[PDB]
C-alpha cells in the first residue's frame, strides 16, 4: 500500500520546523521533524493501520505521536493510507 501526505500535512511539517527553530535552533528542530516523519512511516504496514484512536471526524483515525505534542489524523482510502495533517494537540 502507498503512504501519502496531503499538501496541508506537508506544509504542517515546514510550519513545525519553523516553530521549533526559534525555540531550540535548526539542528534540533530538524531532528524533531525527522522524528515525526519516522513515527508516521509504520502506518504503511497494514498491521498498523488500525493504530491510534477514532478521531472526532468519521472514517478518520488519529495517531498521537510520542515525544512531540502532535497528532497525525489519517485514513485508509482504497490502496492509500493518507496522512491528513500533523496537528498540534494538548496531551495530559
Amino acid at each position: 500500500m502507498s503512504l501519502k501526505w496531503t499538501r496541508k500535512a506537508a506544509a504542517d511539517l515546514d510550519a513545525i520546523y519553523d516553530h521549533y527553530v526559534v525555540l531550540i535552533g535548526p539542528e534540533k528542530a530538524l531532528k524533531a521533524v525527522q522524528d515525526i516523519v519516522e513515527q508516521v512511516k509504520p502506518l504503511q504496514q497494514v498491521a498498523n493501520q488500525g493504530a491510534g484512536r477514532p478521531s472526532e471526524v468519521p472514517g478518520v483515525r488519529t495517531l498521537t505521536l510520542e515525544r512531540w505534542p502532535f497528532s497525525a489524523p489519517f485514513r485508509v482510502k482504497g490502496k492509500e493510507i493518507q496522512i491528513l495533517r500533523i496537528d498540534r494537540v494538548e496531551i495530559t
Partner: protein, 79 residues
C-alpha cells in the same frame, strides 16, 4: 449570558486534580463550577479546532493534493 437550561454533570476525578482545582479557585476568587465550565468549554473548543484541521486535510485528499511519503523523507534529509 446564555438563555439555555443546564444539566448537572458529574464525574470522578483523582484527589490531586480536585486539590489543584480548589487551589486555583482560591487564588482566582472564583468557585469550582466556574472553572469546571471554563475547562469543559475550552476543551470542546479545542476539539472543534481539531475537526476544522482534519477537514482541511480531507479537502486536500479529496482534491488529489497528495505527496508520496518517500518525497517527504527526501525533503527532510531522511532518504
Amino acid at each position: 449570558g446564555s438563555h439555555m437550561m443546564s444539566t448537572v454533570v458529574s464525574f470522578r476525578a483523582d484527589d490531586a486534580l480536585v486539590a489543584a482545582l480548589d487551589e486555583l479557585a482560591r487564588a482566582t476568587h472564583r468557585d469550582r463550577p466556574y472553572h469546571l465550565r471554563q475547562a469543559l468549554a475550552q476543551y470542546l473548543e479545542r476539539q472543534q479546532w481539531q475537526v476544522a484541521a482534519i477537514d482541511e486535510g480531507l479537502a486536500d485528499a479529496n482534491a488529489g493534493r497528495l505527496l508520496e511519503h518517500i518525497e517527504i523523507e527526501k525533503r527532510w534529509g531522511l532518504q
